[model samples]
Target: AAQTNAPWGLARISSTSPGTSTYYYDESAGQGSCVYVIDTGIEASHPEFEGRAQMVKTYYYSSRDGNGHGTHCAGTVGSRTYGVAKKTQLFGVKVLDDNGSGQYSTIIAGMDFVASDKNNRNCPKGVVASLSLGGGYSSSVNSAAARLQSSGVMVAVAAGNNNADARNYSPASEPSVCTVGASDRYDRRSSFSNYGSVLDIFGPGTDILSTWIGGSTRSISGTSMATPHVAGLAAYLMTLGKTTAASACRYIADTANKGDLSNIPFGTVNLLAYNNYQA
Candidate 1:
């Protein structure tokens, strides 16, 4: 059954058109998959999570999310009410600080942790990592993401909000990761979303409503918001047998809604993320 009165991003991904108001999802709902959110940390106790979320690693002293970015991204990934993968396990990797900034070394450490965890025999066979943060080109950060992807963790990263070529950014430009751009409800490229050939696909990012710190919901906009939509979709796909990063990325690109977005940059991919749900 299709869920009514869902977030526009959720509704948008499940349907072919923007006019739809219901979110059509699979019965499996991403069960047996795990998604790691590498950002500011998550408020796992938020009612939106329904006890499915937790903080597993932190580069800082505490795993609390003073900045709401990570929590918001986590909600978009798998929160019961606002997520794309409704039942996937959510792990928070706090690399960024309360100010929403972090050193490259710290970010790399987070990715390493995800890789190690995925290699652990007790971890789920299908694992994904969502990175909604980026900075200028950094060989170290890009290498870390590639390593994570090779370790069998599907990596989804933001294309950045700089409105410039995503090729200029780290992680986003890393060919091994699934770089995601932002699109509006009307199928237009977001004014602030980075573009260019580096972007693998687009996801709803404008005026997105999701879980926040302190157990609340808020509306925000950024490629950060868009990235998780793809991450969650990837997790969902993983449960459907696309467990490897290469297979998941290929499936996402092949199954994406093509030529549906307007105002896309010249070299940017014209595909928009879709959950393969038809209603």
Candidate 2:
């Protein structure tokens, strides 16, 4: 908890100091990659972003973060001090509103905009998509992930925080992207984290702190926070030459900290995902 409160997620995944997680592209600060936080929106005014944050709207009339959730997710992806990719360009795609409610059609439109390379104007390396929202299965979301993956975008989605099987959820159940579940500081799966064959990896989510709205910081928990850890990893890996979505997911899944996860179910140990990666 001290580390996530340290916050350990970013330092463990991207820090040069060792004995825990491996160091990779922190030097570049995910310099060339672009990450899309397809959630409430981003607080571009946050000092942690260093003016690299942008708010883009595909469905919503504007992309300002009225709610704090999207800005927190964006900070975890690339904040200068508390992120995996410190220098990565971050964009807020407002798919959810203040109450965090949106339609599947709205999410699909945002995904299509991401795949269209509309966010690539500032990204030197490539684009990566991170969605922490989940709902019922949507063929449209599944198809959108496929198209984005086909075009070299690495997408990461949160396995619903609902503790049930992730197979019942969309985007997380979608085979094309990384479906991240939540793990606490001790590496135990959160009781509320959705897991199963549909889930891909686990990330630090419990009591995790990051930039919030109004240029402040706070700690929150969910597979929502976990997804950004994995998404940030994907963006950093791309800066290190892990180009395609398939390849990036493969390397991350392979090299992750699988041995650290506690309370692993029988015969489902391999289903656990870890944040540890090698350059």
Candidate 3:
């Protein structure tokens, strides 16, 4: 096997990815789920993806993963080893460039494209947009997410890598999105993870390993790493027929691993406690 660890991020969220009866392989894993990784890009040729990822053309640079971040995030979302929804049809919507810098408008455009794509595909399940990018707040980003949610797309965004309050960041503070923070293997909040009342939940982020560009694997740390865990879980929920953002949000907020983050005060802010998805 190309992957070594069981991917602690999956354990923290309790996602067995559809069927684990055969060495982490599922027969009907997330068949109805669709996910858009609105990030730098993805190595569409990465073997870890096993031809499951779809690279969509956009205004950004080519859909090739020049930066490994996008590929890593995509792997966590739906790769054969680290994915939360193994059967999900992962799509890469490049908004950021090689340096990992992008404009808020670019993000909005990417989301708009994904929303339109959901309609174009007429997917049986709702779409899940994974945004691992964060910085300042922007009304455009918030409104776009709200529109997507209204159109039945679940948006999971990274809270931010800064230790400051996540409420100060965009996408994270965009109330319409699922804001996620980072937690370590010990189940405690990552020291560098941002926290605040706006956070929806925390996921395994520290030293997380997943597929990288060039058909390889890497261990990275950040709320960016954590966001995909929730995104993948959201896709799993959508596959189970929890399509609408309101219902998906309620389901995530209602079901969680509350006790896991008891060591931190921010853990009590809301039901952002990360856990697995069940039908």
Candidate 4:
């Protein structure tokens, strides 16, 4: 929808989301299997993402979408271009709904939902909670993340591209969570990505491909985009019998090449190369 010519070229990498969609069909790959995307609503009808999204639970925090910010994030995790493990679920949480913002208390409610869902039959277990959203650090986030971790839910958060140093936030800055940074196809740290030692891992955040509702595709830019790549990567791992979220993070970290980055060449976007990861 955004880019008319090639809806899947690499704005930074290609129009399509690197290789995740293409990796979904492989029978032997490490699929997230049963992951959870905690963000704005997803485009459940897009072909690339069809039948692959599972919105088992949603927190009606925000009903307003600013230029499809939340939908873009969802495409990265649930789209089936590559593989969906089998039935990947997306837990849409509207914590940041008011004018695209929310109170720390709101996020806690979403986290509480996932933690409490574990015991219910309709609820899921061994699911990775993908939070592409971020906010300032407060005791609220610290307590929430700690609680989720204790419940065995792995938290993947964006290291923030808020045009400020990433060291000043909550969940992304939270030591207990997995903080994702952004990189371009050249494997360079995204010029705007909040950098510092706190940055946990990196993903493709530039010239990226994602889904738009009603059969449209868009090219988005942000650590937000890259974060979901990490999310989808985790989904692949979980399906291979590696259940722990921490272990799943470790597998992706240890398994990826320090992707192609120009700035911090040592530790940047850990490219999944999903196509080659399997077979």
Candidate 5:
């Protein structure tokens, strides 16, 4: 019950420390890998996210403010894990409104911002991105995610809270990205994890505790919760893992608990193997 709190799932035995979970990247590698989290705006003022965020460059496409879901997800990935990669920088893109709803074109606009860094001129090239929120499939930003894959920027999307195939989605099936599903402390797939042949790996998405909208903290679930895990990992790997998106997958597999998935396919995901690498 209290196990899932650790980022890398290897906290019990280790001479390592980090932020946002386990870092494939840390000072041993580097810091300041710009991370763009396109979702509802983050908890803007969170202590863990405050100094580490580039929200001064925030882009709000939605009318409502403070949705909190996206913010909470952001905290999960970039929050100072004390010994983790606490120095990571992130951007919070407000695509979904306070009610967690986003239009296809609106989401695409957010992706366009990341792909081009239009308003976020300060972010470095190949800035990493995390899509903690998703609805159904959209023809617009659906492939808009492709922009990240092509730009050499690592993009990680939530496999979703829905217990259906993610093949119907864009970022997941885009063939150039990493799609993550949910898993509990037991390392088993979340009952709500959306699966498919295209899915990349799994992360801590069940009963995840993180920052809320009201300057407080709370626990929540969904692929939204798990998405940041991989996002943080990508940042860590790109920085510390000293490897590509595919290589990071194997590091995770080598370090992860290798949970029970008898009911699911591919019993365990070799996050380090980079099995899906097309190149």
Candidate 6:
């Protein structure tokens, strides 16, 4: 049966047909998986998390989420109400500051931390990183993400909202990371979303509803919002035994709803993220 009160992004991924109004998923979705939200800090106490979210590490002065971006992205990744992988564990890695800005150094540090955690067995066996931030091309940050991928962590990054070619961006252009673009409920590429060959897939990003900092919900849009949906799907794939980063990426690309999105740039892939939910 289709789930009631699901977000449009969630509903869209579960169904092969466009304009679906409900969501469906496997009972064991996201079990024993962990998703690292490498962005602004998360408000761990948000009711939507149901105590499954925590601040594992932070580059900021305080661990609390002053900017709501991380919480919103986290919610879309695994919140009880607004999530894709409802049962996945969420780890907040605060690289960006309260205003949703950060340097390449801080972002690299966050990626290093995630890689270290994965290496030291501090996180679950099946791990994914949701990177909802980006900047101009930086080899240091790109290498850091590559290292994280080599550490067996699936990294889902936003294909910046620049309305330009994503190849001009750092992690988005980095071959190791799964770069994601934005699509709306009507299956159109978001006007603000960066495109081109760098993007691996698209996810619903328009007017996304998710958890906010003050124990509430808010609707926002960007490639940032789209990234976590793919992150959540990667974590979901992990629970289904696609544990390695490569395998999960392969599954996501292979099973995606192909050629379904409109307004996709000439060089951009027409694949949209999917959860393989059969009704």
TM-score of each: 0.97, 0.89, 0.89, 0.78, 0.78, 0.97
The best candidate by lDDT is: 1
Query: Please, what are the lDDT tens digits per residue for candidate 3 over residues 16-90?
Result: 232122223234556777888999898878777888898885565477878899999999998988777787888
- Alpha-carbon local distance difference test for all models: 0.90, 0.77, 0.76, 0.60, 0.61, 0.89
Model 5 agreement with the true structure over 1-279: per-residue lDDT tens digits: 022345432231121221224223324212656677788787656776657765533345432236778767777767764212345677777777777777777777787777777334443323568888676776555678877556666788877767888877656656567778876655557798888876777766767777677777778788887777667666655665455644554455455434344346553352321111111
Cα lDDT of model 2 by residue, 22-43, tens digit? 2344376678788989999999
Q: Candidate 1 residues 1-279, lDDT tens each?
A: 478999999999988888677899986788888899999999999998998888998988899999999999999999988899998989999999999999999999999999997665233548889999999999899999999999888899999999999888999999988999999989899999999888889999998999999889998999999999999999888886754566787789889999999998788899999887754
Model 2 poorest ten-residue lDDT run: 14-23
Candidate 1 colliding pairs: none
State candidate 4's TM-score.
0.78
| Model 3: CA > 4 A from native | 1-5, 15-27, 266-279
Summarize candidate 6's per-residue lDDT along 117-153 as a digit string, tens digits. 8655444548999999999988888899898998889
Candidate 2 clashes: the total is 8
Q: What does the lDDT read for residue 57 in candidate 6?
A: 91
- Number of the candidate with higher lDDT, 1 or 2: 1
Q: Given candidate 4, what's the lDDT at residue 92?
A: 56
Cα-lDDT of candidate 3? 0.76
Query: Mind giving the per-residue lDDT tens digits that candidate 4 earns over 45-158?
Result: 557655655444544633434336666777776564422233465555555553446577778887877777645523233566777777776777867876876787677788
Error (Å) of candidate 5 at residue 227 is: 1.0
Q: What is the lDDT of candidate 6?
A: 0.89
Candidate ranking under lDDT, highest first, comes to 1, 6, 2, 3, 5, 4
